[PDB]
Subunit: 230 residues, 6 copies
């Protein structure tokens, strides 16, 4: 019922997992959901809804960047009355102690975007992950006993960042990893009194380049279980 | 050879047409190119290369938003040595005299993004379309005798814009239409001494909602011919 | 050994509780610590160190505003090798569902300050509370079974804010309460690979004015116990 | 009928050529217009109106800087119902391939001014030259067969720019030349649904100092003829 | 010896009076200086040097806007080793208690320009008038017993200001009058360890429109005498 | 009658001297005022009112930073109808010619705060000291024949400033000293049609570290006498 979604209210579960890659979503739909049904494929976005441990859960792509994820997340909350959105995906390690394949759970996300300043009267909005979702994720990691780091992430507008010193600065402040959507996502969830969260598997390290599926599967378990808890 | 493209240098034509929808690109690939070959489908992006009037031309999706298109455009220029990128797609009419289905050729694009300020020492960068591409497009429209408006466009970071007064302001300054990529695209082309341009078919009017394929096909002709001229 | 502290390295415990009022700190020192010794009273700041359940703990005032708390927090981390700083105090309720006397635990803090933009290359820094401290506080509340809300806070530079619409905006985004130090505190902790956190008792509601000690004592228990856990 | 103009509605032609130097305008008035009549000399601005190939055309000085040209341009459009303003003058080459005496036709103009952000809700306004005026100028150059470069210009607020790195940055993005008025001019034309344009003769190169009248006369021909076409 | 001045080092007095209008400067040169000699008329700027009470003093136009006055002032300080520049001219009353024809002596000048933020690491630079010049002016007014108000002025980049609420805001903060050069002037004087100052005669009131030469002559006396004192 | 003051309207003199240190205020109260009575000690702020040469005068602490002093100053003007506030204290020398123990009288104060931009529609507000207070202070210094420098000061939000180049920049523009309150103070005085001023004794030099009471006492005399004059 939207310019980017053909699904009707009800086609989506209250809990939706999203990742940038629409093909990764199709994969997750096939691989982890039982009886998954494609509910929306506008712009080949790959929107499915199935079940996990009997619970209804949807998975869909969100593209790259805060602008993209902002369209989808706002529609899902606003139109499809989705209650929870967990962002699963990859990212770039920033902190030196964070290594490739390490799983990271965002508490918050910084950004070089202007979106939040535009929504927050040009002030500093703390793009924070829903504490419930952060707890469910961390609990799920604990229960599964899957090591994972928890802290700040960075949603960059520039994948190829001209400001080469930013990386180092972030390291000094111990930002865990960098991606391109969380910062835009979190505030939207707030606006709708809904919940948002993010957990990514470090695909590489930006401050020095250093089996990769096991990490993805582990991140996916942590996410799926946390969804049940939510 | 990139994190978002599997194609090797050479798989892409010097002139590439891009649109947000990866399915629209597949459609254009099938519909308008002869012997199209999928050169890249990372993130289901839908990258093809074929020929038109015997000339090599590629078509690929670029997602939504300056962050997304910025990744692709930079890689195509930088890695695949693409010389020209024409953005074809839809947009929202802003000016009152601009109506749905009207075809628009961007001279430049404004934005509420921070990307260009980040690349231009926090100054006003005039995200301008390559004059060659603007000429080729306008000439193609003239030759084909297909009416089309030429002027400013707006690349919004917020599809659903909280600043409801912006629309009206843009109308006062006669911005033709609003989309989500041009502003990011144009400066990247400049940086690489390459060429960029945009031509969109107004899918709707934001200041008041007011066969749609004929307009698309007309926009597509104007673009394809302009590519030959380029 | 500083321009604002006479105490020598060692006079402060690894865990320090701070509040704006230097008299409140003296009160907490007397009331909750055993054998408290005034370690610093430069600018009548009221710095004490004593014990709680046998563990060493310091309490000191931090003044009002990010500039003030930024001087103290940086010195404590940098010079006195303090590992944890929990901010205890009052605040103004913003969210409609938050009421006077309700205890609030900050996950993060937004701000209309420029400090963080100055430290973060003019980007959005997510002033986030240390997850360990947020957990210890929430666990302590759970163990003590003392209801408390957890979410975003706002560190205003303007106690008397000229931008009368901000309050309402924050309510729309569900900011829990507003104070004047957290936002400055959190990033400094990050810079020093240390920990920071905040828990305040809502002294009033800014969107409509609506025994007060019981709430303070409850907040104080939650804080003291969380400190032991840390 | 204004604080900066004594001329009454009608004293100015629909097409007005302006340059910073009021003496250059007097020169152009004498040299290129037939039967020129001084219509305004408030602040010795040097406003004339005469004819060229029988068509009415005015020439006047506009001072230096966006603030100055903004006063004049707004009055001419608003009060004297001027339809077209072509800015003729000098500038500093920025691009390495651009040399002294080269004639440049602006497509758009960037700036380190705050004026446009003030008129555009603190967003990036693409100070673009009217496509009609850009075409008329380029056509006139083509018809006259006078080589001229077409691209971005920069309207600096600081002739003596403290940010010594800006120049180099602009070169990387291939800005053609730098002046001090276009950026302010273009948006005003838009606001009045009128037309603006600029064509300057490079008086020097800022990135390395490298008969000068022939270039001026050529630029002047291109401008005068383009005016007839407009 | 500059792009905007033909005079050689020595042609200008250590103390220079400047006003926007080049014709007003010629008038002041003729009217108030003995044996005035035109030292520079590039861009018809009208630069003279003569004597007053036997002391050498120059008068020259500076155009409109911070960009214009910034070129001249920097050259005069830098190249012509001018020690003092007093800005004389007109302005618009802002404060309700300030009336047309009232003479105003600026202590400082605010602005909506970006120039000073560009010179001051994007911080708030207090564009302040040299205390010596402010004293000399106020003393001269006192000695001459010519009533004059002393306080903040505003250097606008937009003579025709789109932000119609600014005026009222300035009134609330009691800004005395608005012009277009001081704010740019003052910081340049600082940079050169030189002196700058401003004294204007209110030509009109912006918050409500309410012999005019007597006021000008009085302002001129105050300025000339203050120059002798300097 | 405020959240930070228990004194009732009348407990404060029309002229109030404030310094960061609440203990310094108590000292000044004891040392320089006759029959001083503590009127407010909320947050141990140390508010006294006594007499000097028979005239009523109050002294109180204001904490550190613009946020802190902004709360107090606004309440004193607004609630306690205070007419004049003179800020006395310490500061850091910036200018090379300014030495430790030198007394400085602020004409204005720059800042890296965002407070004034928040009160001034994101424009440059010239945080200027009341000319009456600047005169009274300078006259008092002259009468007492106590050397003192007069010029720009800087109110930093970051005592420990990350932007290590700022210091040098300020030196180039000849900023006299740096503190943390003036910039916030001055504009508030304006808003209330009241008067504010500042005079500090340089406790150290930031660009190179170089009996200290004599300087303080001298600064205190200058202030007390200026208060009588006011
Ligand atoms: N190093 C990285 N930088 C930015 N985005 C990353 C990175 N690694 C993975 N991503 C994610 O994948 C896409 C960018 O390639 C975005 O969806 C982003 O969130
Ligand atoms: N009205 C509109 N606003 C923003 N983007 C639009 C609009 N219409 C079409 N688009 C385009 O389609 C996507 C947004 O739906 C983006 O790729 C954008 O360029
Ligand atoms: N409503 C409020 N607004 C701002 N600060 C508050 C509020 N309530 C309590 N505070 C706290 O007390 C002081 C402001 O009175 C600061 O230390 C601040 O953190
Ligand atoms: N190099 C340059 N930099 C800025 N302005 C220039 C330059 N060359 C010529 N100009 C023009 O002349 C004046 C500045 O000397 C302005 O009108 C400006 O447009
Ligand atoms: N009301 C006003 N607004 C802006 N500038 C003014 C005003 N009155 C006089 N001026 C001065 O005259 C010119 C603007 O007309 C500038 O030099 C400016 O300093
Ligand atoms: N060098 C300095 N930098 C900042 N503030 C200073 C300095 N010296 C003294 N101060 C003052 O003392 C406190 C900072 O230590 C603030 O009240 C501030 O005004």
């Amino acid at each position: 019922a939207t310019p980017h979604n053909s699904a009707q209210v009800g086609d989506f579960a209250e809990t939706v997992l999203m990742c940038g890659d629409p093909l990764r979503a199709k994969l997750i739909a096939e691989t982890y959901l039982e009886n998954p049904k494609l509910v929306n494929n506008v712009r080949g976005i790959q929107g499915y809804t199935g079940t996990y441990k009997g619970k209804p859960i949807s998975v869909m792509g969100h593209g790259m960047g805060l602008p993209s994820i902002c369209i989808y997340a706002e529609e899902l909350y606003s139109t499809y009355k989705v209650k929870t959105i967990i962002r699963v995906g990859t990212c770039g390690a920033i902190d030196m102690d964070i290594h490739t394949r390490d799983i990271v759970i965002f508490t918050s996300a910084g950004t070089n975007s202007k979106i939040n300043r535009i929504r927050f009267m040009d002030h500093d909005y703390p793009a924070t992950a829903s504490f419930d979702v952060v707890c469910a994720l961390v609990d799920a990691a604990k229960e599964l006993n899957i090591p994972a780091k928890v802290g700040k992430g960075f949603s960059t507008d520039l994948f190829y960042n001209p400001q080469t010193e930013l990386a180092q600065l972030m390291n000094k402040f111990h930002f865990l990893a960098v991606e391109m959507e969380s910062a835009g996502l979190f505030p939207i969830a707030d606006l709708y009194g809904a919940r948002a969260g993010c957990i990514c598997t470090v695909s590489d390290h930006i401050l020095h380049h250093e089996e990769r599926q096991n990490s993805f599967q582990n991140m996916m378990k942590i996410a799926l279980e946390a969804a049940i808890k939510l």
